[PDB]
Nucleic acid binder design. Structure first.
Length: 48
DNA sequence: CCGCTGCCGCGAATTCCGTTTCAGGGTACGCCTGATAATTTGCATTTTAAATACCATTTATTGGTTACT
């Protein structure tokens, strides 16, 4: 657990970029960001 | 050491009328699978050419002849 936190906290900027590419008047910025963070947690789980 | 500044809140008439019910974000794709929404038959209740089984009180035919143009 304490290992995965490090990658998750490292790649938040990546999430920000991908999200802002979709922000143009959808839900709201922060909702997109948080949903992307869910996705990032999934990806960290699946990466080899 | 009990004075003054600067923030932030809050408020600003009445009815009708009119009118365009109206638009704008800029991001993928192909699998299995269950999950409903469609579509297919039979059985209860009417309704059955009518057919049927009894009570009923009210004309009909009636029983005709005895008087008589």
């Amino acid at each position: 657990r304490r290992a995965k936190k490090e990658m998750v906290e490292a790649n938040l900027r990546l999430v920000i970029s991908i999200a802002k590419k979709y922000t143009n008047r959808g839900l709201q910025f922060l909702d997109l960001i948080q949903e992307g963070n869910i996705g990032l947690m999934k990806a960290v789980d699946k990466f080899e």
